[PDB]
Amino acid sequence: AVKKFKPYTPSRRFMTVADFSEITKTEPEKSLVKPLKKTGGRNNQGRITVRFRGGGHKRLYRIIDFKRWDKVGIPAKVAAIEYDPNRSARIALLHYVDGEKRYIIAPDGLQVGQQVVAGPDAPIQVGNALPLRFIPVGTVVHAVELEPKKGAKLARAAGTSAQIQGREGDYVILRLPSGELRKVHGECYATVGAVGNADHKNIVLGKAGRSRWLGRRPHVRGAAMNPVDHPHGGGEGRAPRGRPPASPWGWQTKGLKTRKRRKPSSRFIIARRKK
Amino acid sequence: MTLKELYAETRSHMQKSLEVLEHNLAGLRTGRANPALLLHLKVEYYGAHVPLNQIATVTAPDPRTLVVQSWDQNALKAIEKAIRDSDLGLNPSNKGDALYINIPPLTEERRKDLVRAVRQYAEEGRVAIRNIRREALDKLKKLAKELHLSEDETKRAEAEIQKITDEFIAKADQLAEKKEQEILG
RNA sequence: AAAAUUCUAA
RNA sequence: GCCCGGAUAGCUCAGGGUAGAGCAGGGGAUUGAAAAUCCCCGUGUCCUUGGUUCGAUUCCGAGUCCGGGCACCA
RNA sequence: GCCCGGAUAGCUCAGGGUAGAGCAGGGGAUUGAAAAUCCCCGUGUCCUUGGUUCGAUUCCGAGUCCGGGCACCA
RNA sequence: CCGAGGGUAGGGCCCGUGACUGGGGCGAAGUCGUAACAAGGUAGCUGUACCGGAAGGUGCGGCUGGAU
RNA sequence: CGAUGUCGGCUCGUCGCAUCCUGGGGCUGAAGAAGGUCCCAAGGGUUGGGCUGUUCGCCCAUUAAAGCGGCACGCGAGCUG
RNA sequence: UGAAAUACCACCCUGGCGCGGCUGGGGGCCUAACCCUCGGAUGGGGGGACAGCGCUUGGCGGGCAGUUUGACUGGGGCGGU
RNA sequence: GCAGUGAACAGGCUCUGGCGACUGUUUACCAAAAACACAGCUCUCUGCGAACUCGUAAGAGGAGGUAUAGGGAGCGACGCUUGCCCGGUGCCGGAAGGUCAAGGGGAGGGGUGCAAGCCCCGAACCGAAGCCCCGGUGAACGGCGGCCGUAACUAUAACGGUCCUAAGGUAGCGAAAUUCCUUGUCGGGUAAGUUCCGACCUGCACGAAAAGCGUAACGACCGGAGCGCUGUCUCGGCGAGGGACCCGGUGAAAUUGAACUGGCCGUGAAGAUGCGGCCUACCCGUGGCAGGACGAAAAGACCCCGUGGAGCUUUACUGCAGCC
RNA sequence: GAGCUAGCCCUGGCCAGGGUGAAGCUGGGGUGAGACCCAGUGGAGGCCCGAACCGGUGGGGGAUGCAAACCCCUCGGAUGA
RNA sequence: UGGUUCGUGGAGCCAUGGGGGAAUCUGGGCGGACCACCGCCUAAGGCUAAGUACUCCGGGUGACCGAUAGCGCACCAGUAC
Numbered sequence A: 001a002v003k004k005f006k007p008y009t010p011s012r013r014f015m016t017v018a019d020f021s022e023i024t025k026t027e028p029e030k031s032l033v034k035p036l037k038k039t040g041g042r043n044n045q046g047r048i049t050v051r052f053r054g055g056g057h058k059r060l061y062r063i064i065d066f067k068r069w070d071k072v073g074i075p076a077k078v079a080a081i082e083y084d085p086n087r088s089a090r091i092a093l094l095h096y097v098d099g100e101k102r103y104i105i106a107p108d109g110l111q112v113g114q115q116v117v118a119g120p121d122a123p124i125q126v127g128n129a130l131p132l133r134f135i136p137v138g139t140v141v142h143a144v145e146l147e148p149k150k151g152a153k154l155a156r157a158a159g160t161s162a163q164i165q166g167r168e169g170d171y172v173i174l175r176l177p178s179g180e181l182r183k184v185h186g187e188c189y190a191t192v193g194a195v196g197n198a199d200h201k202n203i204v205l206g207k208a209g210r211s212r213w214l215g216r217r218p219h220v221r222g223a224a225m226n227p228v229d230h231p232h233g234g235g236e237g238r239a240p241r242g243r244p245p246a247s248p249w250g251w252q253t254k255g256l257k258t259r260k261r262r263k264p265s266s267r268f269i270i271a272r273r274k275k
Numbered sequence B: 001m002t003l004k005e006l007y008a009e010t011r012s013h014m015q016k017s018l019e020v021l022e023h024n025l026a027g028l029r030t031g032r033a034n035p036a037l038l039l040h041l042k043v044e045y046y047g048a049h050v051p052l053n054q055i056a057t058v059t060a061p062d063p064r065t066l067v068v069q070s071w072d073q074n075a076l077k078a079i080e081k082a083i084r085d086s087d088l089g090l091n092p093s094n095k096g097d098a099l100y101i102n103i104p105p106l107t108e109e110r111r112k113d114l115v116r117a118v119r120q121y122a123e124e125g126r127v128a129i130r131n132i133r134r135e136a137l138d139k140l141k142k143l144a145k146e147l148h149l150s151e152d153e154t155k156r157a158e159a160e161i162q163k164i165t166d167e168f169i170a171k172a173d174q175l176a177e178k179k180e181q182e183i184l185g
Numbered sequence C: 001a002a003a004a005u006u007c008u009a010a
Numbered sequence D, E: 001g002c003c004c005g006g007a008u009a010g011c012u013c014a015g016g017g018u019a020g021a022g023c024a025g026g027g028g029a030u031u032g033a034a035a036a037u038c039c040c041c042g043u044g045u046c047c048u049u050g051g052u053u054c055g056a057u058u059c060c061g062a063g064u065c066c067g068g069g070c071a072c073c074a
Numbered sequence F: 001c002c003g004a005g006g007g008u009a010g011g012g013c014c015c016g017u018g019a020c021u022g023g024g025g026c027g028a029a030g031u032c033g034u035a036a037c038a039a040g041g042u043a044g045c046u047g048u049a050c051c052g053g054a055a056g057g058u059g060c061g062g063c064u065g066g067a068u
Numbered sequence G: 001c002g003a004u005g006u007c008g009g010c011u012c013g014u015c016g017c018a019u020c021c022u023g024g025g026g027c028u029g030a031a032g033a034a035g036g037u038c039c040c041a042a043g044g045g046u047u048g049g050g051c052u053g054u055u056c057g058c059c060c061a062u063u064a065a066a067g068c069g070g071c072a073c074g075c076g077a078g079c080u081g
Numbered sequence H: 001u002g003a004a005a006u007a008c009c010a011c012c013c014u015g016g017c018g019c020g021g022c023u024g025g026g027g028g029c030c031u032a033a034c035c036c037u038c039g040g041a042u043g044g045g046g047g048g049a050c051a052g053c054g055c056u057u058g059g060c061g062g063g064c065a066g067u068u069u070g071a072c073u074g075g076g077g078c079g080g081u
Numbered sequence I: 001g002c003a004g005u006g007a008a009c010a011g012g013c014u015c016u017g018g019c020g021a022c023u024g025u026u027u028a029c030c031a032a033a034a035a036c037a038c039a040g041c042u043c044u045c046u047g048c049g050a051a052c053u054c055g056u057a058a059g060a061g062g063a064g065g066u067a068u069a070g071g072g073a074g075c076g077a078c079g080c081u082u083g084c085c086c087g088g089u090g091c092c093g094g095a096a097g098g099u100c101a102a103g104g105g106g107a108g109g110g111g112u113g114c115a116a117g118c119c120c121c122g123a124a125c126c127g128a129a130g131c132c133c134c135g136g137u138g139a140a141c142g143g144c145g146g147c148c149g150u151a152a153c154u155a156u157a158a159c160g161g162u163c164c165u166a167a168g169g170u171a172g173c174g175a176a177a178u179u180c181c182u183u184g185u186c187g188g189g190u191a192a193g194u195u196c197c198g199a200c201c202u203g204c205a206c207g208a209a210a211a212g213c214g215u216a217a218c219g220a221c222c223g224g225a226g227c228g229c230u231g232u233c234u235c236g237g238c239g240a241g242g243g244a245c246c247c248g249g250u251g252a253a254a255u256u257g258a259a260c261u262g263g264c265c266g267u268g269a270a271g272a273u274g275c276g277g278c279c280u281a282c283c284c285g286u287g288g289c290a291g292g293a294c295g296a297a298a299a300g301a302c303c304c305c306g307u308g309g310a311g312c313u314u315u316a317c318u319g320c321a322g323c324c
Numbered sequence J: 001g002a003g004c005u006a007g008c009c010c011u012g013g014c015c016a017g018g019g020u021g022a023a024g025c026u027g028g029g030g031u032g033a034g035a036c037c038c039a040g041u042g043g044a045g046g047c048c049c050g051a052a053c054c055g056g057u058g059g060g061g062g063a064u065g066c067a068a069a070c071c072c073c074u075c076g077g078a079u080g081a
Numbered sequence K: 001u002g003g004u005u006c007g008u009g010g011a012g013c014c015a016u017g018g019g020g021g022a023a024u025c026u027g028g029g030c031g032g033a034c035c036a037c038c039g040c041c042u043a044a045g046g047c048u049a050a051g052u053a054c055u056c057c058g059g060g061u062g063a064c065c066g067a068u069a070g071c072g073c074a075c076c077a078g079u080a081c
């Protein structure tokens, strides 16, 4: 339940900030943080290659364990759950009794102090992690390795998850959040459960500032430029697009399937996404 | 189609709207010396209602009085009950193949709505005119295009339409101007 | 278990 | 200016021995109607011309038109 | 102002000597009457001119006025 | 000092009235179609929502004051 | 066209007369008063405001009267803009 | 009785297959090229003769580039020529 | 005491519309806005070695992110809403078919050689994307009509006949940032109101995400009215100082054919100090004003011309990267 | 050539004073329990007033300037995009 | 595809990015598509003086300049600015 505000300022009418109630530790583990290099969307040429980025609050990148197949059969206690400024999700602090500490994305329901553990034999339980083949069909499960030992890549955002729709050979069949039915390898791990912070979708950035805080510069409409600058430019007064509405770089942006056609990953995608 | 025949069509088209104005102005209780104000009225000739311009002869001798010269003395009693019909509030004498109607000096309660009536019929005439003019330019839009006619030509055809349109406007303004001064007189 | 409207007078 | 094609009744059509198919049309059964259903039948050098086989809408030669296909255009 | 159409009865249309259709119009019927239906009946220098054929609404030239397409204004 | 009243300012209620307008009533030999009363020819009524020249239609749920 | 700055207003004017008032006249369908029309006459005069950028014109309240035109639609090395 | 006689041979036609020979297309699996990945690497795991790259083919292709875009004309245009 | 924030610093206000919600941003040096941005709503692409961007590549950015995420497009808090047309165009889907390049195939011809051969040409047929074709697709491009007649009574048409369309503008609004005719008509306010507000609908040419109609609050935005107050005005006066003026010192500039440079009526390339006729006029300054010198200044920026140039557009042409 | 200007990255710095008084906390009331109300506290905000500072609305002046964009009066933001 | 005079032309030769790919003198390339005859020449490794080109430098010489000429610089110039 996001927090609302009485309207003492005209931005404050509909602004909403997260309830923050899953968080216990209000400062990050020192041994696990490192600096986040802020690009402003520029490459190793200093030429912008993502517009309208930069200017946000400073960020200290928290090192996350996406490959929980690292420590097998080692139980670990949920020390704390804290804010990560580098993702939608919440993070969980893991006191491996091994003596090591680790950060993971925080599934919903997971409660501070409980235990979790990897391992093929792991309990099918909130926070534990297993190869998909040893996870029963039809379990809501998040943070999924796409290829074996290639680290969690799918359903790493708030509330996003996946579900198992069946098995086949050395692969199993997954419904991603997008609604795609993909085959992933069986030896890929996955954390059972779905990512927490479900309310994240219902946050109202309230004003213009809040977007500057997130590192997000203003987005200047195509129509507002000039033909020098864009396709949609020019035109005395206002004007409609006057062509198949396109990108700055000149490609159609209203239903132009762009995925590579001959992409060998296609053989493993049962179905396209939904809606 | 062409130009001269479009103007004649226009000047013709606008005339009908102008005469319609004059019809609407007589048939009002003006200075009330008018004969045609009483010329149209719902009567009762042999059960069926019909206009008395197939029943009697309205003639306005003196201005202050008026006669509705009839040719059917069983229709005069059908007319007399049809003059005593809600509206004019007049006390006519009848028979002796006669039917007199004297007119009182128009009161400031009726004089109030008379001018107001005149200008109303006045504007609606002009809107009749102006709406015809736009019909005429559209007749010209196609006619210039259809016939592959010059540009500076199709410009003057517009002005020549305005000349024509300011014709029927000034007369229309003059009609309802006079009819007023007979009410203010 | 049904394809088909309307009606000046004491 | 090459190539691929078709002409079969009123319109549209499938078809080495053979002459068909549908609704339109005419008759008739039923219909107070609209139909719909139902029984009977035509409307043919199967484009011209010419050549094969015992003969041929059926194969070929050459022609006329329409249809599509293609490339080119000093 | 050049290229595809069009004209054929009262309107709208489809069709190498031939004459059609639908419904405006006038009737007849089914109803106690008027309704919408059901049947008939008129209606055509097949737009003017000119040239092919034994003969032309049917082929063609010339138009005329219209649906215009494209090109013109841009 | 208080004080009738005068004046400045800001409010509340009521009445009259207003270009224009929104429906309502009384009329009747109209124009339009024909919803309800027979199962009124789609059983009707109903709260709602949407649409429709108009009465009304339709969706959902309800009522019998619905016929066999 | 190696540039004659173009609408309107303000300021300052000056001229023309086809005269708006004013002064002198003929005729008059001029009783009088007050008008119509033509003739002579440029000396003086020709208000304030609402509207709109407007000149114009409409309207308000006046007056003897609220004249029309020219001067690069007088006048921006004078102003506005 | 057939236009054309039936028995066995012979070269060929309308076809149908049965293999053999050369071609062409599908599908599936495989791993070792090649790609990714695994603090462990002459190895493991994933993809897989696909993807990638080279040559060649046709296309889409104002994202970008070079250009064209006529004259007459009581200014030019527009109409006309 | 005329007077107490006794001097200095320190909001004039109300009523009423338009546009945009708002704080912001912008044409450094003529535009601060209604313009851009903005939260917020929608479409869409992207399963990760993501799509996209930069780059020949390597390699980056995207992101040490992962569909509640990232890109692209439009709209623009919020309130109530956002209709029909898929015929064209775009996109998406379509293992049939039509066309189609290289390549394959080599029927069949040609050159030559005594000849074995050497060499070229070459039909049917197999053969991708693209296209055609079949569908779907509007918060994709876009577009949302004409004419005949019709009721006791006129104009009027709910009805209705009919032509065309891919289909003919629903709600809401309307002389409006849009209305040509136009100062439209009526109403308000004013002694008088082309502006302003309230209406009508004859919308030349509004209209639903280039959103439609409203809305509290906000605005150095753009209208109209009123109160207060005033040199804005009648209509101007006076006073202050700094200049301007005189004296001493120092001392520029653009401009400059030469100058011994008057007015008028004409004439003259059509607007004369300079040519004709006439009138007027002693020589030389200083302070003042600008009518003239078609005064200065800038080889007119409007207009045309040049087979001049440049930026931009697209279903002009031809290519090129990119993608298939 | 980014010592001007534009954006972004890294590291520091600045923002007198005054006004308003959000959520939260506590107490009181309230009810079955709440919702809620109230009181004090607290001190939030692209809130308010207004110097530095950043701007640059209207007006006048300046126009071979003090100045190749300045001066005066007025104005906008002023804890944040 | 380049090169040659050779712009796809009847287009050889020389060169070579892609595919295919021999032979050892009875082998091989060439003589303007091609074929044959007649001739010329021995590819796929390397080196090689001289005659040729230029003028920072040094000398000789001008129907070359004589300080606004002649080098931008006769002079403390790539200086001042």
Ligand SMILES: [Mg+2]
Pocket (backbone or CB within 6 Å): A003, A004, A005, A006, A012, A013, A014, A015, A016
């Ligand atoms: Mg809130």
Ligand SMILES: [Mg+2]
Pocket (backbone or CB within 6 Å): A003, A017
């Ligand atoms: Mg909070």
Ligand SMILES: [Mg+2]
Pocket (backbone or CB within 6 Å): A018, A019, A020, A021, A022, A023
């Ligand atoms: Mg939380």
Ligand SMILES: [Mg+2]
Pocket (backbone or CB within 6 Å): none
């Ligand atoms: Mg450290």
Ligand SMILES: [Mg+2]
Pocket (backbone or CB within 6 Å): A044
């Ligand atoms: Mg670097």
Ligand SMILES: [Mg+2]
Pocket (backbone or CB within 6 Å): none
């Ligand atoms: Mg660098």
Ligand SMILES: [Mg+2]
Pocket (backbone or CB within 6 Å): A138
């Ligand atoms: Mg299931």
Ligand SMILES: [Mg+2]
Pocket (backbone or CB within 6 Å): A177, A178, A179
């Ligand atoms: Mg989803």
Ligand SMILES: [Mg+2]
Pocket (backbone or CB within 6 Å): none
């Ligand atoms: Mg929301």
Ligand SMILES: [Mg+2]
Pocket (backbone or CB within 6 Å): A214, A215
């Ligand atoms: Mg970010």
Ligand SMILES: [Mg+2]
Pocket (backbone or CB within 6 Å): none
């Ligand atoms: Mg956004």
Ligand SMILES: [Mg+2]
Pocket (backbone or CB within 6 Å): A219, A220, A221
């Ligand atoms: Mg934007």
Ligand SMILES: [Mg+2]
Pocket (backbone or CB within 6 Å): A224, A225, A226
């Ligand atoms: Mg712009």
Ligand SMILES: [Mg+2]
Pocket (backbone or CB within 6 Å): A228
């Ligand atoms: Mg640029």
Ligand SMILES: [Mg+2]
Pocket (backbone or CB within 6 Å): none
């Ligand atoms: Mg650029």
Ligand SMILES: [Mg+2]
Pocket (backbone or CB within 6 Å): A227, A230, A231
């Ligand atoms: Mg463009």
